[PDB]
Amino acid sequence: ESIGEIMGKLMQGEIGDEELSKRIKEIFGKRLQWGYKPTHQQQLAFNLDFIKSLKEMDTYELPSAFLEAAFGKTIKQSGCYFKDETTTIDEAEEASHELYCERAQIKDGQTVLDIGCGQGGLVLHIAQKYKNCHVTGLTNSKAQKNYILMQAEKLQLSNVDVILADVTKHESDKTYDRILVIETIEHMKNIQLFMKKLSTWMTEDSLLFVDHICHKTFSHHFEAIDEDDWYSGFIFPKGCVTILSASALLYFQDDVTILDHWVVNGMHMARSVDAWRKKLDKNMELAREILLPGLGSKEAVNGVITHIRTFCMGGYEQFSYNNGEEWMVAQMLFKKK
Amino acid sequence: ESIGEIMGKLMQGEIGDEELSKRIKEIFGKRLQWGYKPTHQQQLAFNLDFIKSLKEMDTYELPSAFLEAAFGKTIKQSGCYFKDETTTIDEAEEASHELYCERAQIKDGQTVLDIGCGQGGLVLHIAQKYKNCHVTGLTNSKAQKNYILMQAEKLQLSNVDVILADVTKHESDKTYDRILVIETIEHMKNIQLFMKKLSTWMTEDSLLFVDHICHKTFSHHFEAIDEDDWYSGFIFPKGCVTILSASALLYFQDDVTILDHWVVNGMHMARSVDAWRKKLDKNMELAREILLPGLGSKEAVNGVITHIRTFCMGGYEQFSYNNGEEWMVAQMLFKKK
Ligand SMILES: C[S@@+](CC[C@H](N)C(=O)[O-])C[C@H]1O[C@@H](n2cnc3c(N)ncnc32)[C@H](O)[C@@H]1O
Numbered sequence: 178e179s180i181g182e183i184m185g186k187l188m189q190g191e192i193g194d195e196e197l198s199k200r201i202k203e204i205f206g207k208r209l210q211w212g213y214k215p216t217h218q219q220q221l222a223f224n225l226d227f228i229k230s231l232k233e234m235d236t237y238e239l240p241s242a243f244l245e246a247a248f249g250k251t252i253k254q255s256g257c258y259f260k261d262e263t264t265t266i267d268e269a270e271e272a273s274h275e276l277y278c279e280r281a282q283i284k285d286g287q288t289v290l291d292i293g294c295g296q297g298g299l300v301l302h303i304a305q306k307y308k309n310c311h312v313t314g315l316t317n318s319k320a321q322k323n324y325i326l327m328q329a330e331k332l333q334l335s336n337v338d339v340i341l342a343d344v345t346k347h348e349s350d351k352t353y354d355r356i357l358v359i360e361t362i363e364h365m366k367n368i369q370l371f372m373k374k375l376s377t378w379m380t381e382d383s384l385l386f387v388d389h390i391c392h393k394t395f396s397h398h399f400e401a402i403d404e405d406d407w408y409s410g411f412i413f414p415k416g417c418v419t420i421l422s423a424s425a426l427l428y429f430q431d432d433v434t435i436l437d438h439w440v441v442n443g444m445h446m447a448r449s450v451d452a453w454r455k456k457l458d459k460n461m462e463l464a465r466e467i468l469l470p471g472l473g474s475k476e477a478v479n480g481v482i483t484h485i486r487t488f489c490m491g492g493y494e495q496f497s498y499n500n501g502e503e504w505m506v507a508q509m510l511f512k513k514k
Numbered sequence: 515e516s517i518g519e520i521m522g523k524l525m526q527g528e529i530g531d532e533e534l535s536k537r538i539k540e541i542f543g544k545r546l547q548w549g550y551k552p553t554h555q556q557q558l559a560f561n562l563d564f565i566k567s568l569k570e571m572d573t574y575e576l577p578s579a580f581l582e583a584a585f586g587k588t589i590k591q592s593g594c595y596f597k598d599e600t601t602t603i604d605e606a607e608e609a610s611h612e613l614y615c616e617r618a619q620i621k622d623g624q625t626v627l628d629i630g631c632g633q634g635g636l637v638l639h640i641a642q643k644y645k646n647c648h649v650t651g652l653t654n655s656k657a658q659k660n661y662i663l664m665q666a667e668k669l670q671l672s673n674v675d676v677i678l679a680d681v682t683k684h685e686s687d688k689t690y691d692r693i694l695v696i697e698t699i700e701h702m703k704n705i706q707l708f709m710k711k712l713s714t715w716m717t718e719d720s721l722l723f724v725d726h727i728c729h730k731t732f733s734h735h736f737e738a739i740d741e742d743d744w745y746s747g748f749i750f751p752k753g754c755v756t757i758l759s760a761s762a763l764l765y766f767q768d769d770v771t772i773l774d775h776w777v778v779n780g781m782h783m784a785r786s787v788d789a790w791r792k793k794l795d796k797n798m799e800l801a802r803e804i805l806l807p808g809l810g811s812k813e814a815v816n817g818v819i820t821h822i823r824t825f826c827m828g829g830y831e832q833f834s835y836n837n838g839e840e841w842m843v844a845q846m847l848f849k850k851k
């Protein structure tokens with residue numbers, strides 16, 4: 178069977194969930210074979226080759242109504258935290274926001290910058306919880322900026338601003354007590370330059386908190402290993418996402434210094450994408466109606482839905498692999514050098 | 515059975531090699547159970563607790579004739595490198611010296627400092643290979659200084675000096691192009707202060723190369739877990755040796771920045787201690803004769819020999835565990851911040 182044949186059946190809804198999960202699990206299984214080496218000597222050789230390679234490098238948006246139908250209350254687009262099997266996505270968003278506040282040592286009165294803030298759930302959480310904080314979200318999306326500002330207005334929050342910028346091009350002398358990067362570093366083409374830039378927005382009193390999807394042992398770009406992987410390039414059509422190992426950022430301490438380091442087991446991410454998948458499925462009719470005017474045809478709507486749903490189904494297999502002990506979430510706390 | 519009972523039988527030579535190896539292997543097996551955690555989340559919690567704990571902290575010598583009877587030609591007292599099963603200890607010393615020169619990027623004309631240089635094998639190797647290098651060994655032993663200076667004289671080397679100092683107390687404004695630390699960091703009570711001090715002896719052009727015994731996954735002090743471990747406190751009577759994880763020094767980048775990172779599989783160390791054990795056994799009669807005047811009695815001689823021989827037997831079990839994939843040697847290359 179060819180890529181086109183599997184892709185044809187997928188877009189027509191001919192692949193059942195059981196087969197779909199099985200196919201994507203097998204693709205990730207092959208990535209594990211690719212990444213694990215027989216000795217720690219070889220593992221470190223492999224890992225350092227990847228780290229060295231990184232140091233040499235360098236219109237359409239979904240309507241808010243659709244995003245509200247698929248994601249949780251604050252439209253968090255990152256791994257959440259589930260205390261219980263019955264923890265709801267809304268509760269899991271709040272729990273994850275609270276976890277970031279604890280680990281980033283957020284205190285009332287601080288200036289806070291959230292880089293790649295998305296729909297601003299964390300920005301709004303900190304602003305509401307800590308009235309004397311000033312909280313700045315930075316996003317490259319005008320729609321996202323507008324969404325956050327509307328929400329801040331509705332919530333009577335007067336301590337929020339949003340910078341509309343590509344972070345890689347943003348120039349400022351402004352510094353912040355706290356810089357947060359929640360599942361945004363994965364999209365950075367030049368990590369060393371990114372960390373350098375962030376350090377210039379810090380004083381000696383500042384802390385930097387990074388949360389990123391990882392594998393516990395090795396790093397990889399999110400891409401097809403071989404011609405049998407129809408999945409990776411379907412989810413991310415460009416070579417834009419890097420999955421760092423849980424320890425990869427320890428080698429990016431030119432300009433910042435590590436203070437603490439954690440991982441959150443992959444079942445939390447698994448439960449996050451599962452919740453999004455189930456909510457989308459529940460609101461399927463409504464989602465199709467929302468997307469129709471902006472996409473022009475039912476076929477274009479089906480394609481967008483298939484893409485997001487498959488992202489969740491595949492994400493589930495990736496992060497649930499070996500009870501969350503392969504792909505997971507890494508977190509690190511840094512000070513300036 | 516008690517500690518004293520096993521220790522009594524050991525000192526009397528009543529424990530055969532098979533039983534001795536079995537007993538020490540079991541002690542190290544229990545250390546593995548202690549160190550491995552069920553999830554990477556728990557592993558990192560455990561590892562960071564250890565790293566944080568480190569950041570809060572802080573007459574008799576063996577005659578050269580005995581050392582020559584037990585160790586290889588240059589009396590190297592660190593893991594060596596064995597290309598073949600039939601590689602001799604002398605060849606393995608030279609191979610390891612060459613490996614350090616390659617990985618530390620030693621070039622003719624550089625100033626080189628070797629911290630805790632021991633009997634000076636590496637100092638003498640670099641001095642002979644690179645005539646325009648000036649090579650300084652630093653050791654806390656007057657006997658070692660005298661040995662190195664005699665060897666340099668015999669070898670017609672004019673580019674060697676030795677500093678007699680406790681490195682933790684040594685104060686100087688002198689800087690070096692290359693600083694080498696070969697299995698000495700294990701003895702440092704305050705690692706953060708140690709790395710800070712080393713950085714002050716570096717310029718922007720300098721490199722620092724550290725080689726240390728490690729476990730691939732976790733860190734531990736070389737000490738008894740429980741009352742059943744007669745071995746650890748017999749080998750090192752004080753709490754003076756720390757076995758860092760293969761990645762532990764990545765968290766000590768306040769003052770230096772990582773450039774490269776390797777491990778050497780534990781079978782190389784295993785073959786090193788095996789070679790020392792076998793050479794001591796071959797030269798047993800001679801060793802007893804050498805040690806007798808300085809120790810006063812045959813019983814005191816037996817005790818010293820038992821200690822060193824057991825060190826080798828135990829070291830073999832430790833480093834050969836799972837074909838060298840538990841305890842091994844970590845190497846790191848740094849520049850100044
Ligand atoms: C997976 S999301 C996470 C968003 C948010 N932090 C959260 O937890 O919900 C990654 C975000 O990074 C943003 N992003 C990617 N590249 C960027 C850039 N160069 N400048 C600013 N934002 C960027 C994306 O638009 C996206 O909103």
Ligand SMILES: C[S@@+](CC[C@H](N)C(=O)[O-])C[C@H]1O[C@@H](n2cnc3c(N)ncnc32)[C@H](O)[C@@H]1O
Nearest residue numbers: 590591592630631632654680681696697698701
């Ligand atoms: C295992 S040996 C390695 C010696 C040598 N680098 C080699 O590879 O053969 C560790 C050395 O560090 C030395 N050492 C320990 N503490 C020291 C200190 N505070 N100052 C200087 N040397 C020290 C010990 O005396 C010992 O020679």
